[PDB]
Amino acid sequence: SPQSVRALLERHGLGQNFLVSEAHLRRIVEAARPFTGPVFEVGPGLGALTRALLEAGAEVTAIEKDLRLRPVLEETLSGLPVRLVFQDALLYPWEEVPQGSLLVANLPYHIATPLVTRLLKTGRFARLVFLVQKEVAERMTARPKTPAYGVLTLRVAHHAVAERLFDLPPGAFFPPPKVWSSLVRLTPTGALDDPGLFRLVEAAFGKRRKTLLNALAAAGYPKARVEEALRALGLPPRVRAEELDLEAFRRLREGLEGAV
């Protein structure tokens, strides 16, 4: 099986960490069920997760930037009808997928946050299940008042219910990577962007060493108006941004309406 991987590669001529362990595949696919809409996978690689998905009866469009893997993917998915697209993941037209679609994917570190933020803002998906480097998972699912908490945690919570389901070790892949990976499931609520809310949240976390009062003041918020907003909401004068959950940021936004 690691030899089978190596032979496959050598057969076709061939830089990445391919997700390969059949046992871990079960759980990702299970995590994605039910398949109530079509499924989009980024980075099929050798096609191992694509295979498990197709055999589970998902209808899969797999989007692969490396055309050199087309023969590989053809060989590995034979018997299974799939749509293969060769395109950069962030340039694929995500705003055009069927409403109700799912993402199920092993995501490269560099693409994961931009791609998930983009998909959440479309408001178009039923469910996003993906593997990501653990530290990216912790931000997406962080608790207030921990170092992984920040804008990204609040972006995800605004759009979706977020779960970190389990970690996967390097032996899940070949070659094995030098990081822990995590399987995240996000379940969109149907909430779309709130650009005004996210201007406030970005400013709040802008000056990470200050009270929220003084970080907002440094972003241009009129200072006495912020002291008033915080005290009417019953917050400590010296409260920090990482202490506010999404509800508190909403209530703060309403109290600062027009500030601007």
Give yes or no: residues 161 and 257 share one domain.
Answer: no
> In the listed set 192, 213, 234, which residue is the last one of a domain according to the structure?
192
Give yes or no: residues 185 and 214 share one domain.
Answer: no
Q: Find, among 168, 163, 164, 166, the residue nearest to 181 by Cα.
A: 168
Contacts of residue 7, defined as CB under 8 A and 6 or more positions apart, other chains included, come to none
> In the listed set 192, 227, 245, which residue is the last one of a domain according to the structure?
192
Distance CA 210, CA 230 (A): 15
What is the structure's resolution, reported in angstroms to one decimal? 2.0
Could you tell me how far CA 40 lies from the centroid of its own chain? 14
Give yes or no: residues 129 and 74 share one domain.
Answer: yes
The secondary structure of 2-70 as a DSSP string is HHHHHHHHHHHT----EE--HHHHHHHHHHH----S-EEEE--TTSHHHHHHHHTT--EEEE-S-GGGH
Give yes or no: residues 18 and 105 share one domain.
Answer: yes
Give yes or no: residues 167 and 139 share one domain.
Answer: yes
Distance CA 150, CA 117 (A): 14
Q: How many domains does the chain have?
A: 2
- Experimental method for this entry? X-ray
Give yes or no: residues 134 and 26 share one domain.
Answer: yes
The secondary structure of 220-255 as a DSSP string is T--HHHHHHHHHHTT--TT--GGG--HHHHHHHHHH
Give yes or no: residues 180 and 199 share one domain.
Answer: no
Structure tokens at 207: 């000056």
Contact 165, 31 (CB under 8 A): yes
Contact 39, 53 (CB under 8 A): yes
> In the listed set 175, 192, 209, which residue is the last one of a domain according to the structure?
192
Give yes or no: residues 157 and 225 share one domain.
Answer: no
Longest alpha-carbon distance in the chain: 70
The annotation places the binding site for S-adenosyl-L-methionine at 17, 19, 43, 64, 88, 106
Give yes or no: residues 166 and 242 share one domain.
Answer: no
The CATH code of the domain that includes 171 is: 3.40.50.150
The CATH code of the domain that includes 219 is: 1.10.8.100
Give yes or no: residues 166 and 197 share one domain.
Answer: no
| 173 membership: H or E segment, kind and range | strand 173-174
Residue-number span of the structural domain to which 260 is assigned:
193-260
Could you tell me how far CA 238 lies from the centroid of its own chain? 32
- The dihedral over CA atoms of 31, 32, 34, 35, expressed in degrees to the nearest 10, equals -160
Give yes or no: residues 136 and 168 share one domain.
Answer: yes
Q: Find, among 120, 228, 108, the residue nearest to 179 by Cα.
A: 108
The annotation places the binding site at 17, 19, 43, 64, 88, 106
Q: Residue 84's CB: how many other CB atoms inside 10 A?
A: 18
Give yes or no: residues 138 and 181 share one domain.
Answer: yes
